[PDB]
Structures are given as C-alpha cells and as structure tokens.
Amino acid sequence: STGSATTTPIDSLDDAYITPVQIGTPAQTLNLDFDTGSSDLWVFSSETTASEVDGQTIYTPSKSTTAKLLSGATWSISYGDGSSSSGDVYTDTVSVGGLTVTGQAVESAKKVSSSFTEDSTIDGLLGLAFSTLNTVSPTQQKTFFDNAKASLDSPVFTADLGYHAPGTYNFGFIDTTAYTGSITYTAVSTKQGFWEWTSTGYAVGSGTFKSTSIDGIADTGTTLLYLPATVVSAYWAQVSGAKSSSSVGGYVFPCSATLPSFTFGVGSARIVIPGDYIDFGPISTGSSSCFGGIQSSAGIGINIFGDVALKAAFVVFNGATTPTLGFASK
Ligand SMILES: NCc1ccc(C(F)(F)F)cc1
Ligand SMILES: NCc1ccc(C(F)(F)F)cc1
Prior knowledge:
Layout: E1 3-9, E2 17-23, E3 28-35, E4 41-43, E5 68-78, E6 84-96, E7 99-112, H1 114-117, E8 124-127, H2 144-148, E9 156-160, E10 167-171, E11 180-187, E12 196-204, E13 210-218, E14 225-227, H3 229-236, E15 243-245, E16 250-254, E17 262-266, E18 269-273, E19 279-282, E20 289-292, E21 294-296, E22 303-305, H4 307-310, E23 314-318, E24 324-329
Parallel strand pairs: 3-8, 4-7, 13-22, 14-21
Antiparallel strand pairs: 1-2, 1-10, 2-3, 2-6, 4-8, 5-6, 6-7, 9-10, 9-23, 11-24, 12-13, 12-17, 14-22, 15-16, 16-20, 17-18, 19-20, 23-24
Enzyme class: hydrolase
Family: Belongs to the peptidase A1 family.
GO molecular function, one term: aspartic-type endopeptidase activity
C-alpha cells in the first residue's frame, strides 16, 4: 500500500508546513506538522486547557468509535527551541493520504507551551524520527511510519517541500517524475534517534567547494539551516553589511542585498540552495534589516539541515533495516 498527501506552507516565509491527517472514526481532519526530528504524534484535543487553545482544530476522542484510552500512559516533550507539551494517550485509527494505520498512539495534549498556542494553523505534530525518541511512559510507542512499514510497498517516505508553494509527502514509493538526474544515497546513523548523516562539504556562491565533514540531522520540523560557526561566518562574509546581532539572535543583513547561493555535498553530488531561499524577510514590520536563513549551530550542539536545505531537494527517507537518506536535485 501507499499514501500521498499535499503539504502547504503556513505563511509567506515557509516557517513550517502542514499536512492534513485523518484521525478517528468518523474521520476528524487535523493539519499536522510532519517532523522528522521527533517521534511523537500529538494533537490539540478536547482535553487541552481551554485558555491554551486559540483557533486550532481539536481532536475529540469521545466522538471517535475507534478511540481507546491507553490506561496510565503519559507523555511529555520539550523541543530544541524551548517548546513543550504533555498529556495522556489514546490509540485510534490514523490515515495519511489514503494510507491507514490502526492502533496508532495519538498523544492528547493537556498542556501546550505558548509558541504552539500562538500558531493557530498547526493542530499538532506527526513525528517521523526513530521510535527510540518517543516520550510515552511507561510503555514507549511506535511512530506512524514504524506502524505502517509492514504494509508499505517499500519501507520509504519522501519529502518534496515547495519554495513558497505546496509540496508532497509520499509513503511507500518513490515518484521518479518528481526529481531530475539520480538519487545519491548516504549512510544514516540512528544512534541518537535522528535521521543523522554526514555532508561532504560546502561552497558559497560560485566559490571553491570545501571538502569537510559536517555531521547533522535531516529535520523537516526545523525552519532554518544550522551549521558550524566557521561555515556560517564564511557564508555571511560574502554579504555586504551582514552581521551577527545578539539582540536579534543571529545573522541579519540589509534587505536590499542579494544573497549568494549555498551548496552542500552529498557524497559526490552537490545540492544548491538558491540565495532567495535564505531570505527570511524583515526582523520587524517596516525594518530594513532582514533575517538570514543560515545560522550558527554553536548554541544548539547539533547541526540541523532544516527546511531551508531540504526544500532545495527531493529527499528519500529509506527506513530499510540499514537506513539511508537519498538526495536528488529537482
Ligand atoms: N524538529 C524536532 C527537533 C527539535 C530540536 C532538535 C535539537 F535542537 F535538539 F537538535 C532536534 C529535533
Ligand atoms: N521542531 C519541532 C517544532 C516545530 C514547530 C514548532 C512551532 F513553531 F510550532 F513552535 C516548535 C517545534
């Protein structure tokens, strides 16, 4: 079996992407943020503190004939940006783009942090990292992908994110019309629970490619590209007037500047990020300072190939017994 669903940017800056997901019987459709950097499926629900809900669509387990409370199970998650949420756990039927999993753990939020409440377009997250990171206690739960793996035609899903445009998540097959050239596959380490891989280097604009190993994670749930300080400094040095701002929390640049492209290595292949993808617009309404899409990972502890990088490519998440990541130009 296979599934295919359209994913849509939530705003004009591509800050995140939402994908419709059917939960329960009869279906309740929620727009979830597909996150290859986490492993919990959690949703706003009828159990969420009413003051913490502001326009989200909520899951109501009492209206689903297939929902079952997972007795005594709880969950609690904190994300790398300081976001958090927690609650209890149901099992229910979950379908993505025609692909149905029964008995999927659906984590119902009782408390959510402010950053989720203010994001009225995101009804929850669907985690697609490895199940070892799932926070359900005392019995850890599997991700949607792990539960679907057996019935998929191939144990893969692909992310085809659009630049200021809709894109596609596919489960169980590789659309050979969605990319150009060949797919370059590279090894994945699962030791930390992430889709972790090693990039073979980088180039700024039309400069010389610098061969150097950059270990990082493929994370559809993170907007920007976070790379070591040496790399990020070399990129922004090519932008007239760009500087690191402590009050803003990263590199900013004059909105009138033209940004160079950024190339990253996948084995012997090269993925080119157009400079326009790195512009995240004015730091405040009316400002002439703009926020950069490539920032330093020094404060984070891990390098993150977020949406800025992934949307420049067709990306295969191969969940075979030896997992791999594939990248193709598009
Ligand atoms: N998108 C989920 C996520 C968030 C934060 C991190 C960090 F910061 F810990 F690396 C990894 C994955
Ligand atoms: N990386 C996971 C993640 C995704 C989205 C959000 C936001 F933007 F909704 F707060 C926080 C954390």
